Amino acid sequence: DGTMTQEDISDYVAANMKDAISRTSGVGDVQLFGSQYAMRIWMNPNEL
Amino acid sequence: RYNGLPSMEILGQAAPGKSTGEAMELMEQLASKLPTGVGYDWTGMSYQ
């Protein structure tokens, strides 16, 4: 429905799916094809 | 927390005469009519 971006889908999987899948029966390592959201502080050197 | 998610453990039992299966089936029915984003699961003796 084009309400969630690539970065938004990656967060939801990382935050609400990955942990449970990684603890699932017979599952070894789990690799996220993306990244979980973090609080990004994009600094401006001119304003600093 | 249960399986890495916020939870609240609820104890209980079947009334005189009725079995554990019937009591659990009703809890599953009552749990389905709860607000959006509220799930459930069985643990300990109920898991077995």
Swiss-Prot record, chain B:
Signal peptide: none annotated. It is found in: Cell inner membrane. It comes from the Bacteria. Induction: Positively regulated by MarA, Rob and SoxS transcriptional regulators (at protein level). Disruption phenotype: Loss of susceptibility to contact-dependent growth inhibition (CDI); inhibiting cells still contact the target. Belongs to the resistance-nodulation-cell division (RND) (TC 2.A.6) family. Homotrimer, with large domains that extend into the periplasm, interacts with AcrA and TolC. AcrA may be required to stably link this protein and TolC. Interacts with AcrZ. Part of the AcrA-AcrB-AcrZ-TolC efflux pump. AcrA-AcrB-AcrZ-TolC is a drug efflux protein complex with broad substrate specificity that uses the proton motive force to export substrates. This is Multidrug efflux pump subunit AcrB. The chain holds residues 818 to 865 of 1049 of the full protein.
